[PDB]
Design a protein around this ligand. Structure first.
Ligand code: UYD
Ligand code: CL
Length: 304
């Protein structure tokens, strides 16, 4: 399959996915109701844009991507369904971009967005210009370059998303396991816990699981993970730990301890132990990736 057609390509979760597919070398087409600067940029990058939804727009396409559910009202979708052209939801296409890059999946019930942003900030301070996904929207710091150009893709992994168990990361964080999305799993918390184990087991044997052991449920499933693991938290037995937490204004300072490394003083410009924890998760991923202490310190403290 080589040509991908987006129905409603100007949509805010859609243009980013189309841009990354352009960057990967695919043929990309899309349709929208009104021309925009979004569809202008995509056309500049090689996308064939159609204005208005007519079934002839889906000709040549090997797969269709749609904004929400398969609403067969739209003629392009109906024409693809008739020809047995697969129609995948936006979130599934987004999730599969990780197979082409060194993917860092940030899972957990709370803190996915801030941790994803802190990781992106540290990797960028290291010159790695990563593409990152928060709230289904693809981002990167350097405006002019195409999304997906970087080796690295950092994405939120939401346990209530249909594509949760189809991410293929190299590294996965689990910040915490709460019951917010029990309904996704038949209102059963034990089923939810087992899904996070299944998720971590989608890492390859050379992958890395980053586990917050201050959360009691993360700590509970830890011995089930048959993948390389680094634990973090304020707990005294964690591999990567924060001590001597203090404040100077709205900035939090602390010392991070790491195996086989000297203590490193670090600050973040957000209050609360939950942001100390977001930073520790970041420090673990950046350390394992080989990023310098200077880029770690600059990425964390320069984060707005
Ligand atoms: C922006 N943000 N970032 C969060 N990050 C994390 N939260 C927790 N636990 C949460 C709840 O369990 C928590 C809340 C308060 C203090 C300590 C822990 N554990 C984590 N481990 N690593 C990262 C991380 C949480 C938040 C909210 C939305 C709750 C303000
Ligand atoms: Cl289908």
């Amino acid at each position: 399959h080589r040509r991908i057609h987006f129905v409603g390509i100007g949509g805010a979760g859609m243009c980013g996915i189309a841009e990354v597919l352009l960057n990967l070398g695919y043929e990309v087409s899309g349709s929208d109701l009104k021309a925009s600067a979004v569809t202008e940029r995509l056309e500049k990058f090689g996308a064939q844009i159609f204005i208005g939804h007519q079934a002839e727009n889906a000709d040549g396409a090997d797969v269709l991507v749609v904004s929400s559910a398969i609403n067969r009202a739209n003629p392009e979708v109906a024409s693809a369904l008739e020809r047995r052209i697969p129609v995948v939801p936006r979130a599934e296409m987004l999730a599969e971009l990780m197979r082409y890059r060194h993917g860092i999946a940030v899972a957990g019930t709370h803190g996915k967005t801030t941790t994803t942003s802190l990781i992106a900030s540290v990797f960028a301070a290291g010159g790695l210009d990563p593409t990152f996904v928060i709230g289904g929207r693809l981002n990167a710091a350097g405006t002019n370059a195409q999304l997906g150009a970087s080796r690295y893709l950092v994405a939120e992994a939401d346990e209530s998303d249909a594509s949760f168990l189809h991410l293929q990361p190299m590294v996965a964080v689990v910040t915490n396991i709460d019951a917010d999305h029990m309904a996704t799993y038949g209102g059963d918390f034990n089923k939810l816990k087992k899904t996070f184990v299944e998720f971590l087991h989608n890492l390859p044997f050379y992958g890395l699981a980053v586990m917050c052991v201050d959360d009691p449920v993360v700590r509970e499933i830890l011995p089930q993970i048959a993948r390389p693991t680094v634990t973090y938290g304020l707990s005294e037995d964690a591999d990567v730990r924060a001590i001597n937490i203090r404040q100077e204004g709205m900035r939090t300072w602390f010392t991070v301890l790491r195996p086989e490394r000297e203590p490193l003083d670090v600050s973040v410009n957000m209050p609360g132990l939950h942001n100390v924890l977001n930073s520790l998760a970041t420090i673990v991923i950046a350390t394992d990736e080989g990023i310098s202490d200077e880029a770690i310190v600059q990425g964390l403290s320069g984060f707005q």
